[PDB]
């Protein structure tokens, strides 16, 4: 919702990209707790 983390999905592959160019990619508490969601929801996906 914060446009902090972005993604690109192919058929069988998944790209998770951390976008925070201002603070030098330093993750906040919210952004990290979010990444641990996108990572395991990308990783526990069926086609990845």
């Amino acid at each position: 919702a914060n446009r902090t983390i972005t993604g690109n999905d192919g058929r069988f592959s998944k790209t998770i990209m951390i976008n925070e160019p201002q603070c030098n990619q330093a993750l906040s508490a919210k952004t990290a707790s979010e990444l641990s969601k996108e990572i395991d929801k990308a990783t526990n996906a069926v086609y990845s």
């Binding site: 914060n2 446009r3 972005t6 058929r11 976008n19 925070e20 201002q22």
Partner: protein
């Protein structure tokens, strides 16, 4: 005879109304009538409550459960934060290899409209608005030539299309990208145009056909919820195969499936599959 969940054994001193059975009070027809009506509508009210809990959407249920979860006794004041963490970040793009520059949202004062665009992305050609040369000709719409751009770029097997940027156009793109009819898309906050990335599979495109709903701007088609519901039904089998995009009174760009979900009617834009 050990009992779990039953709390103090034999409860506490509670007899049933019928069993204890105190002598029935004789109410005047007034008292009795009022009892009957208040407890009738008490039952009505309860039936309502249950039906509402049955029909609650999952998102509502999750918000409820995790709202109660975090609930404290005192309603605590918000804590002061850094000068801001909450600026919506700018979507990443590469400056050197580009369709368009990703323009900052911090520049929002500089921007123009679709009609009168502010000078930006000079190194790129600027798409022109398509307008009729005479009376009998159709009156074109950004949706019309959005669809035809995509169709023709799909026929020539191109990876990228530069396409007109209006509210319902990039709405249409987000919906198509939801359904996976399109590899990706981006609005660079360029005034005129934005870009779509097409997807091909097994040598031909992912898009069989893509067609606008109206040829003119002078004609506007309205979709009843029952119509959008008919589309979904192929002789008794539920069919989401084909997608129809539409405006709502709420300015949302929706597919027909969410529309049918919330039973709202909308104005037609295009079909794609």
């Amino acid at each position: 005879a050990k009992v779990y969940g039953a709390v103090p054994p034999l409860g506490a001193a509670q007899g049933h109304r019928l069993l204890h059975g105190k002598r029935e009070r004789e109410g005047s027809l007034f008292a009795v009538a009022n009892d009957v009506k208040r407890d009738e509508r008490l039952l009505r009210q309860q039936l309502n409550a249950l039906l509402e809990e049955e029909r609650m959407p999952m998102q509502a249920r999750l918000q409820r459960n995790e709202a109660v979860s975090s609930h404290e006794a005192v309603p605590q004041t918000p804590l002061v934060d850094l000068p801001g963490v909450e600026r919506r970040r700018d979507l990443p793009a590469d400056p050197i290899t580009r369709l368009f520059f990703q323009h900052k949202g911090d520049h929002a004062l500089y921007y123009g409209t679709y009609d009168k665009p502010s000078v930006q992305d000079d190194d790129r050609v600027q798409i022109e608005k398509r307008v009729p040369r005479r009376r009998e000709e159709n009156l074109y719409t950004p949706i019309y030539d959005f669809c035809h751009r995509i169709r023709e770029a799909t026929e020539q097997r191109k990876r990228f299309v530069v396409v007109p940027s209006t509210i319902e156009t990039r709405g249409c793109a987000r919906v198509m990208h939801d359904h996976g009819l399109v590899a990706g898309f981006r609005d660079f906050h360029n005034d005129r145009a934005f870009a779509v990335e097409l997807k091909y599979f097994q040598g031909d495109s992912t898009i069989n056909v893509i067609e606008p709903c109206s040829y003119d701007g002078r004609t506007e088609f309205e979709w009843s919820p029952k119509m959008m519901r008919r589309l979904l039904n192929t002789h008794g089998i539920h069919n989401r195969l084909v997608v129809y995009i539409c405006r709502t009174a709420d300015n949302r760009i929706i597919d027909h499936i969410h529309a049918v979900k919330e039973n709202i009617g909308g104005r037609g834009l295009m079909m794609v599959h």
